[PDB]
Amino acid sequence: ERLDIFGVPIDRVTMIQAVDILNNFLQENRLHIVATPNAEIVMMAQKDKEYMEILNNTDLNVPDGSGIVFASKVFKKPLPERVAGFDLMLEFIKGISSKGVKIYLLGAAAQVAEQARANLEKLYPGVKIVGTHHGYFTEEEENKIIEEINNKGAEVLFVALGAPKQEKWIYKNKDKLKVKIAMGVGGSFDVIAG
Amino acid sequence: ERLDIFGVPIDRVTMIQAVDILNNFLQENRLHIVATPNAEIVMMAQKDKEYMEILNNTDLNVPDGSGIVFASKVFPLPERVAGFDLMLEFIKGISSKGVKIYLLGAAAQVAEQARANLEKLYPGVKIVGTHHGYFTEEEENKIIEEINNKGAEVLFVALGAPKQEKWIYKNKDKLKVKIAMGVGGSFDVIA
């Protein structure tokens, strides 16, 4: 089920299998941490012990980009396909948009997650995005942000802070966040906000 | 020819067109800066004025990943391209042409392992030198001099965005290469 790319475990999953695993996570009443490691993240983890530890403690590590798939070719069972973290997020949203799954968007500059919300509502009619908040917050602002996420009863939280900040923030707040899925999505809100 | 994605100019090119442009850059006696902007880079450039300036002064910006292509759907980029595949496809073509390549970046012996693996993958490839990326100021002088003395034409900079673009741009008048391109974690995955 998993392969090791320089200490980083990667779930041997296709896009469809990753979406199915995320849907199954919604049936388990606990926080699930999802990361999408790519070649850049593997490189970063070699120099960042804390990041390497987090990546070894997530519920699902979906491969992102081409580089990580190429690295897996050394194995008898390589990674089955090239997956983009961006496409995984959209495909997962698409499926839950008709199920009433409460989504929270946290990250990017002022009004970017609001614009992303407006655009996702047009793209996926019926999507339930319960709240949004910018990603250039201090540690002081953090507790009020987590309280709003929890008060709105969010089931899925997309964290557009960029790697490794997004994984580190989720992991540090793993016992505070009352969501079922927390997933780092990097620049995904910016490109949907157009 | 170029699309603006939140201030970042993106060359409206397919992978093959990008490879053809890079081949043509080898015929021009000047440094060409190549970046592969993705959604993450676009986001970084909104808060980093110096990075935004560099991305507006590169010779070629090839789209990387799905997010940036999705953003272009407003009016689009012809295809989803990975910067990693662009690097390999460009190496593949120049491996039989004697084009000198320098590998700079990544931890300890990763760049040298990447060199060994590229020599197996593309027989005839001319990688004249390698160096790790966690270098000091005194080491930069030695690296730049090695790059120029060995006569490298193509430089792959595996330092990660924005460090890779910033390092190339700061040293744009020191580097005697025809192409300098940031490649992120590309050496690690070839090693």
Residue numbers in the entry:
A (entry chain A): 3 to 196
B (entry chain E): 3 to 77, 80 to 195
Verbatim from the authors:
The TagA N-acetylmannosamine transferase catalyzes the first committed step in WTA biosynthesis. TagAΔC contains the highly conserved amino acid region that defines the WecB/TagA/CpsF family, but lacks 49 C-terminal residues that target the protein to the membrane (see below).
Selenomethionine (SeMet)-labeled TagAΔC in its apo-form crystallized in the P21 space group as a dimer, with eight molecules per asymmetric unit. Each protomer consists of eight β–strands and nine α-helices that form two distinct regions. The N-terminal region of TagA is formed by helices H2 to H4 that pack against a β-hairpin constructed from strands β1 and β2, while its larger C-terminal region is comprised of a six-stranded parallel β-sheet (β–strands β4, β3, β8, β7, β5, and β6) that is surrounded by seven helices (helices H1, H3, and H5 to H9). The arrangement of the six parallel strands forming the β–sheet resembles a Rossmann fold commonly found in nucleotide-binding proteins. In the dimer, the C-terminal helix H8 in one subunit packs against helices H2 and H4 located in the N-terminal region of the adjacent protomer, burying 1,212 Å2 of solvent accessible surface area to produce a narrow pore (detailed in S6 Fig). Analytical ultracentrifugation (AUC) experiments indicate that TagAΔC dimerizes in solution with relatively weak affinity, with a monomer-dimer dissociation constant (Kd) of only 7.4 ± 0.7 μM. Consistent with the native and SeMet-labeled proteins adopting similar quaternary structures, introduction of V43E and A72R mutations into TagAΔC disrupts dimerization.
